[PDB]
Symmetry: C3
Subunit: 55 residues, 3 copies
């Protein structure tokens, strides 16, 4: 078994496309800064803390 | 450095095989809807929220 | 869109290199047992539970 992480630009695309992305595939909604993992029948959003500066 | 996500069907397989999967490798137990990441000496289960419908 | 997980040995390397690693790329600081995901402008550390024994 194996998977990956799928990048997205808006919670738009990912919502009309979470249909394909097979089980156990992280789902990144970049503009929303949201990471969910594709589960059995729908998705389960993983908990992250507030952002840490980059510079 | 680089890794990936490893898919599984039951908390069975993943338990007798978490031995190989090297550090920093997410571990997905599909049937359990559990995502853990392989750490230094054992695994650290990542926190997810309750499932969001797919349809 | 697509990404991956990037492995590191110390919160050193990852701090001077979180600059490259593009959006939506998990970041693993192995020695710290920390998993963050690279977001819009800096990183957002994902929440994990305490470690589970491996043996």
């Amino acid at each position: 078994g194996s998977s990956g992480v799928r990048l997205w630009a808006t919670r738009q695309a990912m919502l009309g496309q979470v249909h394909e992305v097979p089980e156990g595939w992280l789902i990144f909604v970049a503009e929303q800064e949201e990471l969910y993992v594709r589960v059995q029948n729908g998705f389960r959003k993983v908990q992250l803390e507030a952002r840490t500066p980059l510079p």
